[PDB]
Design a protein around this nucleic acid. Structure first.
Ligand code: MG
Ligand code: MG
Ligand code: MG
Ligand code: MG
Ligand code: MG
Ligand code: MG
Ligand code: MG
Ligand code: MG
Ligand code: MG
Ligand code: MG
Ligand code: MG
Ligand code: MG
Ligand code: MG
Ligand code: MG
Ligand code: MG
Ligand code: MG
Ligand code: MG
Ligand code: MG
Ligand code: MG
Ligand code: MG
Ligand code: MG
Ligand code: MG
Ligand code: MG
Ligand code: MG
Ligand code: MG
Ligand code: MG
Ligand code: MG
Ligand code: MG
Ligand code: MG
Ligand code: MG
Ligand code: MG
Ligand code: MG
Ligand code: MG
Lengths: 103, 132, 49, 101, 129, 162, 311, 113
RNA sequence: UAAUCGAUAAACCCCGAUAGACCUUACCAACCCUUGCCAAUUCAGCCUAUAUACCGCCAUCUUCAGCAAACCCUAAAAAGGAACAAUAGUAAGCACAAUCAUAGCACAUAAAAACGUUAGGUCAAGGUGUAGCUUAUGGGUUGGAAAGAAAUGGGCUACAUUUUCUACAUAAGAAUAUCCACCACACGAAAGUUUUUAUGAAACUAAAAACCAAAGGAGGAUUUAGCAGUAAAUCAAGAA
């Protein structure tokens, strides 16, 4: 049984139904244990790409975009890039045909 | 002629709750707010949710507790828990009252995924502010 | 989700707990409309006859 | 039951629009770029034109969630003026008072 | 009650700025009283002030169908109190704020800003590259 | 509750309604649990948790001479099922340049480098950080920026001589 | 209803103790002043109408007075004027007239007013009519009209009240600065979105500085400089005084006017007690109540309406 | 559509149209249901010879019977509303002349006729 | 037009819309689906007919002072019911008034403003009584609509010197409808043609430049608004 209201709240909180105090709004969200350099610095994923092409212009833009993006995990940011690798690599034809040789 | 949330003058015999006797322009002057939550303050989020939520708890309490509800139902939100106060008329035999207390708290808590606290204040007859 | 609220309170009506005055009004009225001899036609029957 | 058929339609357009969000985003990125070749952009053009257009964002219409009314909704409460007023005037809406000044 | 002491050099706060938003001025008055009375007992050395009130008004039509000559207008007022505390320890802040927040009334919100004291980062102290 | 209390707007009888079944006293948030006696007791129970403030720090001069950097960090509480508030991420650095080990060349290069985030009147270099989902992360990155700016301000290069 | 008053006063005192012991004060010196603070802190209602805010008060201030039992248990009424339906009134009347008669056989602007109608209604615990009130007061004039005895004067004193009247522009004592050892006065005017503060130094070169620049440059509109000139040209001090000025909000005329008010306020330390009433009658020290009027919805300009159509 | 529905009273105002009323509050007990559950605090007393009855479901036929009971209840009420026409005639039919109005009211003084 | 509805004396006419490219959408054109959202139901679903069946929200008299139970009187009562040196009226209630808000007064404005009236408005906010539809008056996909002979309501910008331009904040410099063959210029292009850009899957939409510079030279009968920080002029913000 509950001996007091304080008892009540206490059991709620151990249980996880009440909130922790004082509040930190990031409680319960660990964000994968990632750190800032695993968000901001995107060199890792640009290693496979033509280094002097307009492709670099574009993907440096996407880089900057995803570097500034709070609403995404690392795994999603990655997925975007890999989707672009897959995309550009799927069309070799159009790369060759536009007046630039692309790898 | 404003018909908003108002109760018309009868032959003068009609019983009226303090709330239903105080017209919309009176909110925050004499009458208070039936609900309380953070959501409508300047910098705040998710006001809408607490509104849907509130509405559904009005209908829910009116339906779970038939014929025994006295005055409109007073919701408070405090630090993720709901405190639902009700003025309830005495009709039911007390067993049934506690059955429905447990029933409500549990059911709601698992619906809104946050802990609910319920309070029944029992009253012999509807309070009469005017006429009668 | 509207289906959630609607269906949940619906079952909770027949489990005897919830009480819907609106659907009860609906009900009683529908009963009194079928009673006088106008109901809702068995699908496919109404027109061609 | 959602209150109207119009609502069903728009519920579905919300679910669609959440579904394809990233296809849209990704494809449109190339499409909106002056740095890329035009050749890429034409094909990509055909590509966003390809994906179901009930899944496009602008095809979404905020409604009053209770009452379904397509216009008159106040963004913050996702409510029609009539419903909003109705609530606020029993006092069921917190912190809203009839304004004098 | 269980207290533990860990060796690590607890965080200092130069200024702890606590804003309470509200609707009713009364609630914020009594809450000020409570906060100041809690702080006076915990030796916290605090000040309080009243920032300018915000009033947001907007307009709806007065009828269901058509009289656009006729409108209703609604308000929401947002009233402020700020408790500004000086020279707090880490734990001091954690407890005091815990006591504050736990007792926060239902009509009000609270916005905390801490300004934390850190000497210098390690790679900058006096190395140069 | 022992205390007789009448609230409500009166009828022309002149009687503010009684304390029983009074809806509008049931609306009022009550500070009852918070009656000053209770506070005194509470705070004496909390005294055990609170830890002492260092003596010398009484004056801002000593703070600055000892601790140069302020890290501004905000946190919000609003009632509802989610404790998620987006606004919390944001971190600020205030750092006084005069407290820094800078070369003449290094200082001037850092000013031009940083731009608006430097206040030339108050010497307060500010850094706001947003970009990352978690507060700790923004802290790390703001520290990173500080570090970097200092390391880069001392490095002379060709175009500098141009 | 008297049993209610007994009960209520008892419970009021019991709840009084109960209040003191929780609020932690000596139950003895507890006042209404303390009662208020107490409830106000316990049940904090933001509400505009102040009667609908929580109250614990002595039932006598809470409840209306009652008309006592008017007849014995035999049915027989106590007062002989009972059948008049207003005994309370006509008793005052009988007595008043009696006083008058005795005065006639015997005889051979302090801020004092007669009661309002509401105050006689409170004094007799009786609803009244205007005519009735008027009749009575008329009678009291008849009373004052004759030689005034001792009990005669006491009698009319019952129905006497006294009212305050206060007119002076509040005079700030000057302030002598420590730096030059010199006296200054600092005024604050406020007009129409624009506040100004003006420090006036008693020994001037005629220098007048505004927000850190000269007044000619800050008011290129001549009209404004005239407005500024008004108080000083009034008090003939034009060269004598040296003013520093800080003004913010609104547009130029509003600013010049705010400075007018602030200056004319800071000029009443260095003026004579007599010139003050002049500056009042010149209207220098009185604020301008005039401000913008809010547009009204369904209209144009708060006054201007959408063009109205007869057809 | 649960959101769309309303309170009973409102529905009867907007049914009746005064600018006869039957009540649905009559006959239904708490926990009463068509899916036929017996809830420990409502349908059934909280305890039997043995304590703390569990959550139980009646038969098909027990429910057919309780439903028959509510049906016959409604029939009973309708008959009771129709039987409500009875009168004593004063002179002729709808003429109120000569109709007994019933003894006058007791005055203030306790005087009774 | 193959192609919505509603409002339409005062009390319609930038009105429901604080808002239609697709969507919204109710419309027309073709195609398609029949326990066809839900836990269960000879059941769903209907922007189909009733606003002269209604609840809701309002308009209107109206910044008008009255409405109304409970009684009492009138050589009878359909109804009426006051005179203050008073002649039959008393009465709690709801209105007005009073207090609240516009951060202190005061005034001003805001709000409020019953009972009824106009069978005033709205079954397209939603909900309902009565009626109808049920392999369709239901539900989906794809396109398509919103053209001007006019006639009129309200706005915007003008018709210029109290003006126009540039600088600029409120002392400046130039332009200035007639010379005359200007290499046209004075006001006035919000309109169009062209090019961009914003949004968007889709420009038919908005903005900006370049061009072009038209009617207009202060307006018939008749009319609208405003009593002070108002009218008039000027600028900025928000709702969606
Ligand atoms: Mg009106
Ligand atoms: Mg849209
Ligand atoms: Mg104007
Ligand atoms: Mg007959
Ligand atoms: Mg029509
Ligand atoms: Mg019509
Ligand atoms: Mg009309
Ligand atoms: Mg108009
Ligand atoms: Mg369309
Ligand atoms: Mg249809
Ligand atoms: Mg018709
Ligand atoms: Mg009508
Ligand atoms: Mg109606
Ligand atoms: Mg009157
Ligand atoms: Mg009469
Ligand atoms: Mg006031
Ligand atoms: Mg007034
Ligand atoms: Mg008005
Ligand atoms: Mg009034
Ligand atoms: Mg009609
Ligand atoms: Mg008409
Ligand atoms: Mg309908
Ligand atoms: Mg129906
Ligand atoms: Mg179809
Ligand atoms: Mg279509
Ligand atoms: Mg014309
Ligand atoms: Mg004009
Ligand atoms: Mg000039
Ligand atoms: Mg143009
Ligand atoms: Mg031209
Ligand atoms: Mg011309
Ligand atoms: Mg005329
Ligand atoms: Mg918006």
């Amino acid at each position: 049984p509950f001996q007091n209201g304080f008892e009540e709240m206490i059991q709620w909180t151990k249980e996880g139904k009440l909130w922790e105090f004082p509040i930190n709004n990031e409680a319960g969200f660990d964000d994968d244990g990632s750190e800032f350099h695993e968000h901001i610095f995107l060199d890792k994923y640009l290693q496979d790409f033509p280094k002097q092409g307009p492709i670099r212009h574009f993907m440096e833009l996407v880089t900057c975009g995803l570097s500034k993006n709070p609403y995404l995990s690392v795994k999603q940011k990655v997925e975007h890039i890999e989707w672009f690798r897959n995309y550009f690599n799927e069309k070799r034809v159009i790369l060759k045909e536009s007046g630039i040789q692309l790898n | 002629k404003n018909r908003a949330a108002r109760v018309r003058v009868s032959k003068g015999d009609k019983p009226v709750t303090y709330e239903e006797a105080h017209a919309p322009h009176y909110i925050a002057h004499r009458k208070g707010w039936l609900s309380l939550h953070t959501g409508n303050l300047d910098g705040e989020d998710h006001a809408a949710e607490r509104t849907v939520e509130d509405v559904f708890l009005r209908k829910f309490m009116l339906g779970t507790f038939p014929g025994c509800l006295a005055d409109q139902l007073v919701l408070k939100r405090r630090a993720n828990q709901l405190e639902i106060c009700a003025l309830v008329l005495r009709q039911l035999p007390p067993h049934k009252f506690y059955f429905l207390v447990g029933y409500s708290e549990t059911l709601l808590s698992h619906f809104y995924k946050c802990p609910v606290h319920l309070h029944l204040q029992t009253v012999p007859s509807k309070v009469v502010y005017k006429y009668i | 989700n509207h289906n959630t609220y609607f269906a949940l309170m619906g079952t909770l009506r027949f489990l005897g707990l919830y009480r819907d005055e609106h659907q009860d009004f609906r009900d009683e009225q529908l009963r009194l409309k079928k009673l006088r001899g106008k109901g809702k036609p068995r699908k496919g029957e109404g027109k061609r006859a | 039951y959602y209150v109207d058929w119009k609502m069903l339609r728009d519920v579905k357009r919300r679910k669609m629009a959440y579904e394809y969000a990233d296809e849209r985003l990704r494809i449109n990125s190339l499409r909106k770029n002056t740095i890329l070749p035009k050749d890429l952009q034409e094909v990509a053009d055909e590509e966003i034109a390809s994906l179901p257009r009930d899944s496009c964002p602008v095809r979404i219409r905020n409604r009053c969630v209770m009452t379904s009314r397509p216009r008159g909704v106040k963004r913050r409460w996702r409510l029609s003026r009539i419903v909003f007023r109705h609530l606020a005037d029993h006092g069921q809406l917190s912190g809203v008072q009839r304004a004098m000044w | 009650p269980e207290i533990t002491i860990s060796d690590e050099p607890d965080t200092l706060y130069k200024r702890l700025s606590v804003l309470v938003k509200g609707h009713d001025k009364a609630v914020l008055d009594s809450y000020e009283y409570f906060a100041v009375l809690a702080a006076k007992e915990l030796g916290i050395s605090i000040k309080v002030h009243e920032p300018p009130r915000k009033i947001e008004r907007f307009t709806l039509l007065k009828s269901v169908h058509i009289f656009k000559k006729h409108r209703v207008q609604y308000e929401m007022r947002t009233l402020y109190r700020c408790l500004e505390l000086e020279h707090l320890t880490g734990s001091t802040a954690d407890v005091y704020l815990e006591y504050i927040q736990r007792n926060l009334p239902e009509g009000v919100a609270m916005e905390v800003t801490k300004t934390k004291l850190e000497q210098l980062p390690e790679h900058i102290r006096k190395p140069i590259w | 509750v022992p205390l007789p209390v009448r609230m409500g707007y009166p009828v022309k009888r002149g009687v503010p309604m009684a304390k029983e079944g009074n809806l509008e006293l049931l609306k009022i948030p009550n500070f009852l649990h918070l009656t000053p006696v209770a506070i005194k007791r509470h705070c004496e129970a909390l005294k055990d948790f609170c830890t002492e403030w260092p003596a010398a720090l009484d004056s801002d001069e000593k703070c600055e001479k000892h601790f140069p950097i302020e890290i501004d960090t905000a946190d919000y509480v609003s009632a509802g099922p989610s404790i998620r508030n987006p606004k919390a991420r944001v971190v600020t650095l205030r750092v006084k340049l005069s407290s820094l080990n800078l070369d003449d060349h290094a200082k001037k290069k850092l000013i031009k480098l940083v731009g608006d985030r430097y206040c030339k009147s108050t010497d307060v270099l500010t850094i706001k950080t947003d970009r990352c989902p978690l507060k700790r992360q923004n802290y790390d990155y703001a520290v990173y920026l500080l570090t970097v700016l200092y390391h880069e301000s001392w490095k002379t290069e060709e175009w500098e001589k141009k | 209803t008297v049993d209610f008053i007994k009960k209520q006063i008892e419970e009021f005192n019991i709840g009084k103790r109960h209040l003191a012991n929780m609020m932690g004060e000596d139950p003895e010196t507890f006042t209404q002043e303390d009662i208020d603070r107490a409830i106000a802190y316990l049940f904090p209602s933001g509400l505009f109408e102040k009667r609908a805010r929580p109250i614990m008060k002595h039932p006598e201030e809470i409840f209306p007075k009652q008309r006592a039992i008017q007849w014995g248990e035999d049915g027989r009424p106590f007062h002989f004027l009972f059948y008049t339906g207003k005994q309370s009134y006509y008793s005052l009347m009988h007595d008043t007239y009696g006083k008058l008669l005795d005065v006639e056989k015997h005889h051979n602007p302090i801020g004092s007013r007669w009661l309002i109608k509401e105050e006689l209604e409170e004094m007799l615990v009786e609803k009244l009519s205007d005519q009735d009130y008027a009749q009575f007061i008329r009678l009291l004039e008849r009373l004052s009209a004759l030689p005034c005895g001792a009990t005669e004067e006491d009698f009319v004193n019952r129905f006497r009240r006294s009212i305050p009247x206060x007119x002076x522009x509040x005079x700030x004592x000057x302030x002598x600065x420590x730096x030059x050892g010199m006296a200054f006065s600092r005024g604050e005017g406020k007009r129409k979105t624009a506040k100004a503060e003006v420090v006036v130094y008693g020994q001037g070169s005629g220098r007048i500085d505004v927000n850190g620049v000269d007044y000619l440059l800050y008011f290129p509109v001549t009209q404004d400089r005239e407005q500024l000139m008004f108080p000083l040209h009034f008090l003939d001090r034009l060269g004598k005084h040296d003013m520093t000025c800080a003004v913010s909000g609104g547009g130029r005329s509003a600013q010049a006017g705010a400075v007018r008010l602030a200056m004319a306020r800071a000029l009443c330390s260095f003026v004579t007690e007599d010139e003050v009433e002049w500056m009042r009658q010149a209207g220098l020290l009185t604020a301008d109540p005039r401000v913008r009027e809010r547009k009204k919805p369904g209209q144009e300009g708060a006054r201007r309406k959408f063009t109205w159509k007869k057809r | 559509s649960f959101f769309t529905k309303l309170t009973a009273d409102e529905l009867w105002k907007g049914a009746l149209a005064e600018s006869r009323r039957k009540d649905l509050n009559r006959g239904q007990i708490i926990g009463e249901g068509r899916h036929g559950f017996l809830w420990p605090g409502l349908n059934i007393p909280l305890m039997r010879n043995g304590a703390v009855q569990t959550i139980a479901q009646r038969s098909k036929e027990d429910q057919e019977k309780v439903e028959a009971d509510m049906v016959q209840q409604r029939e009973e009420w309708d008959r009771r509303r129709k039987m409500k026409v009875k009168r004593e005639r004063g002179w002729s039919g709808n003429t109120w002349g000569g109709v007994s109005l019933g003894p006058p009211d007791p005055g203030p003084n306790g005087e009774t006729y």
